[PDB]
Design a protein around this nucleic acid. Sequence first.
RNA 1: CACCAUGUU
RNA 2: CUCUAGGAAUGAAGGAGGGUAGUUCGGGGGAGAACGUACUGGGGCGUCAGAGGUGAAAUUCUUAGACCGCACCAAGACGAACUACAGCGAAGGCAUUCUUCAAGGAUACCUUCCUCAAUCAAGAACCAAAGUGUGGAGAUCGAAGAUGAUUAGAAACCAUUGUAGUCCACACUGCAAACGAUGACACCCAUGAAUUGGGGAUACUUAGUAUCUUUACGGGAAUAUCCUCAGCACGCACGCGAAAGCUUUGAGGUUACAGUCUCAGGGGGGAGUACG
Lengths: 85, 116, 89, 94, 104, 52, 143, 33
Amino acid sequence: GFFDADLSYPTVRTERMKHKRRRLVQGPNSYFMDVSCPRCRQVTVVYSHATTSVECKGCSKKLCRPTGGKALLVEGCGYRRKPDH
Amino acid sequence: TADGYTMRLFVVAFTKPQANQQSRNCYAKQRLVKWLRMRITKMIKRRLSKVQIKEAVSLLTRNVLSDALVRRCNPILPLRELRIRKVRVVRTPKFDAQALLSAHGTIPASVEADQE
Amino acid sequence: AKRTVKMGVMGRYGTRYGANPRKRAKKLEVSQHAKHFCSFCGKFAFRRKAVGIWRCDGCSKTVAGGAYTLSTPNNSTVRSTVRRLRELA
Amino acid sequence: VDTINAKLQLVMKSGKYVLGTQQALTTLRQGRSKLVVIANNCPPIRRAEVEYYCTLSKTPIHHYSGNNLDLGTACGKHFRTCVLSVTNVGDSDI
Amino acid sequence: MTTKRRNHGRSKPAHSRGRVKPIHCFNCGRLTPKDKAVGRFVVRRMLDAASARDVAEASPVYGANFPMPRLYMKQRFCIACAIHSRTVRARPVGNRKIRYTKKV
Amino acid sequence: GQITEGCIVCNVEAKPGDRGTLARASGDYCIIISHNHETGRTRLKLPSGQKK
Amino acid sequence: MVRMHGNGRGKASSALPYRRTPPAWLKIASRNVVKMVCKSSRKGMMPSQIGMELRDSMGIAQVKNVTGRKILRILKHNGLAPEIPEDLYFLVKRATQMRKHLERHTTDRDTKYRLILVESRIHRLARYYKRVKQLPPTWKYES
Amino acid sequence: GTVSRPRGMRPKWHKKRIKRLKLRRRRMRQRSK
RNA sequence: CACCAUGUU
RNA sequence: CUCUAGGAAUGAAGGAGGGUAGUUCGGGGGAGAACGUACUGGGGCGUCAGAGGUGAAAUUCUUAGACCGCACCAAGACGAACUACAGCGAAGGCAUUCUUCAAGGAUACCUUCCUCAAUCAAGAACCAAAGUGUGGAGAUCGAAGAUGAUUAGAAACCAUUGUAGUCCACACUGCAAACGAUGACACCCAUGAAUUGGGGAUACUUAGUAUCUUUACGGGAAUAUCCUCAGCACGCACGCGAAAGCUUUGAGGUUACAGUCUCAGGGGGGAGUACG
Ligand SMILES: [K+]
Ligand SMILES: [K+]
Ligand SMILES: [K+]
Ligand SMILES: [Mg+2]
Ligand SMILES: [Mg+2]
Ligand SMILES: [Mg+2]
Ligand SMILES: [Mg+2]
Ligand SMILES: [Mg+2]
Ligand SMILES: [Mg+2]
Ligand SMILES: [Mg+2]
Ligand SMILES: [Mg+2]
Ligand SMILES: [Mg+2]
Ligand SMILES: [Mg+2]
Ligand SMILES: [Mg+2]
Ligand SMILES: [Mg+2]
Ligand SMILES: [Mg+2]
Ligand SMILES: [Mg+2]
Ligand SMILES: [Mg+2]
Ligand SMILES: [Mg+2]
Ligand SMILES: [Mg+2]
Ligand SMILES: [Mg+2]
Ligand SMILES: [Mg+2]
Ligand SMILES: [Mg+2]
Ligand SMILES: [Mg+2]
Ligand SMILES: [Mg+2]
Ligand SMILES: [Mg+2]
Ligand SMILES: [Mg+2]
Ligand SMILES: [Mg+2]
Ligand SMILES: [Mg+2]
Ligand SMILES: [Mg+2]
Ligand SMILES: [Mg+2]
Ligand SMILES: [Mg+2]
Ligand SMILES: [Mg+2]
Ligand SMILES: [Mg+2]
Ligand SMILES: [Mg+2]
Ligand SMILES: [Zn+2]
């Protein structure tokens, strides 16, 4: 025997694979990271799916490259997902 | 070429499936096809414009140009086979007897006029 | 109110000369009396002053081109070819 | 070109400008001009005279890609303009 | 009348494309849409086994190591021409849906 | 001899120095076909379609 | 875009979070966000652009969740709203660029067809804006 | 055979007959008005 | 792949 | 010390519209310049008695050199193989390369906005081929016509030709088995193997994984596994249907008959004819 799937309380397996607007309650896929300057050690918040190119406010060069999905972070910079809330 | 020869080259390339590929086709994206065409055009133009017609003929007969083309184009697109299908001289410079002599080196003798 | 249904400036001919010859002449008659854009001075002030002669009211420039229009379609292509052949040298 | 048109729209709404050759030359004479824009169908003698004033006053000069009709449209006007002179940039960062 | 084939005898689904440019039949030259024509790619030997062995004896180039050239040609037929030449035959109603994806 | 292949020309001199005798009527022109540097001659297509 | 003039059925969009409160690490005060919104508008950015720069480089996922007001509402309170609504501005801009292209390419029949759809969209949009008094009455789009 | 029983001549050629007949009647009324 | 038209209610 | 009317507004629809991005995706559209063999013709260089064509022939071409052979020249079409139950387009339609100009869709987004929508008389635009007008062009094929066959007859099928056409520009025409013979929008809906484009990953509290190329459109490209949105589909569970068949692509969820709008039909002919 196997556990039948409750519609009100789906298992984490099935809900994880779902599209963001196909979940039981829709929500974002994106997040913000703390990006330190590759040669400045200045931390600027960068959107995960940023499409406008982001500068380091003191470094004044590119931090990420826009793509069709998640932004491509510049080489040799530290980052960490800021908590969703 | 360097000695005033105009050559039209025709290169044909074919995509190939990868070793572990299970797809029913290996059609290439048009972006990569145009990139492959541009790289082939640049390499052939750069390699052949600074050489003479005699050296260019050697580059084409011993497949030195073809080997370098398939080596530098495979990273763009996995290629089953890259081949120079046709080479044609379309414009020649004015005739030069000394240039023809230097391209022939030691001309072998002919015995056709000689008595049998 | 609109004064004629089909013919415009051709209404001066009355019932003479036939409908098809009138229609063919109407297209050129309208264009030869119209205001054409002046590439100089950026105005719509080019008027025909004889066959092939166009004088702009705005800037008083005189241009030779076209029996009934300022620039023939053949001239537009010829202008492009000449500029293309000029850049090739 | 869209970039110059975008900044021209900003000047039209925030900065100060003058339209016409005679008024633009006046601004150049008193050194109040920040930028001069000339249409591509300006008469060659008038274009050279405005250019000489810009060189003497060290005023930046921009050659517009359209004619005086296009330049007038880009400023939100219904009339042509051969020369435009900017005396205050507003927030256009020109 | 009754629909004989869900395919309607071609390879053009209802919302794939509007028009496929026709081709001339290999035999008679009838114009038939390229997706509908019966297409065979045939590799043909220039000479039969008896003739190939005779030409190979007199050939210093062709022999056991160097194969003789073959004929390569894509042949597209009209429906009537393909039935007459027996490249394709009428099939029982059940077997009509059998499709082959490679030369066998 | 200074004009490229395919250039459209008018007021063409049939003989050098005749001050223009070909392609002079309204809307008419000649098309340059080729030059031959060996004999110093230029080939053109006349408005009537003849080649000269 | 999708379900008007073209039978496209795309579903790409954003999915706003259920939790509306700003994250605890956002240290920018509400009055400072309003300052950035107005300063951005004065540089010539439209509300869609303004919200993207704050999202991309400033960590502000939603200006409304921080200040209680939307981007366009903030601009209207500061006299910085566009004279024409932004979506109508871009539709009118596209129609102008397509008509200018059609001046030289008179045989581009596909572009002509697309222009009919764009101008049909403008008039439907202008009717709505005239009804909600966001545009002057007798405002007209002209070619 | 691709269509069902027509009960008459080929409809396309029946259409051509009607078109030819309509043209003839049109000209006949021209020479009476 | 020459030529094979017709059959009173 | 100076100013101080400025934060109190349902929410952002797995409804619509805009925005930004990969400078994404594609036989989508327009412009320019080139390229490719082939058909036909033309000389040049060779050869000599036939060639062509058919079931068999003949009309036809040919020692005034046909056919055939080689390299070329001109002109107009066309874009083979790759080419697929593949892609793009509202449909009609769309297939060489490069350079260009406006668009279009999908996807991505914690950007914007706030019912702006669905479907339609009237009205408007587009619409294969043939056909029409005026200019071009005229290689190929080819209504009409000519000639040769076949036949009882054959002004048909077959052969040799050939006009209008076929191609382009501009302006008309608005008909197609313009078909999925299936109107548009929305909801639900079982299974297996694929495919096109874009992304993500490498009645339970969380469950894997690689390969190849790799000095510049290159922090690259293609693959493998899994997931996802959108698109054309295949073999196939309910249910439906007079049946053939249809089936997340309905023709299912309908006598247990009601989501919304719209078009058309009422035995066969006369007839899509007459009249206006
Ligand atoms: K019988
Ligand atoms: K001969
Ligand atoms: K019709
Ligand atoms: Mg593939
Ligand atoms: Mg499609
Ligand atoms: Mg069709
Ligand atoms: Mg078939
Ligand atoms: Mg609608
Ligand atoms: Mg039958
Ligand atoms: Mg049947
Ligand atoms: Mg029927
Ligand atoms: Mg009948
Ligand atoms: Mg009888
Ligand atoms: Mg919404
Ligand atoms: Mg293009
Ligand atoms: Mg020949
Ligand atoms: Mg010959
Ligand atoms: Mg091809
Ligand atoms: Mg036609
Ligand atoms: Mg004609
Ligand atoms: Mg008989
Ligand atoms: Mg008889
Ligand atoms: Mg006969
Ligand atoms: Mg007879
Ligand atoms: Mg005959
Ligand atoms: Mg006779
Ligand atoms: Mg109909
Ligand atoms: Mg059909
Ligand atoms: Mg359909
Ligand atoms: Mg119907
Ligand atoms: Mg329909
Ligand atoms: Mg796709
Ligand atoms: Mg996929
Ligand atoms: Mg009912
Ligand atoms: Mg009835
Ligand atoms: Zn003027």
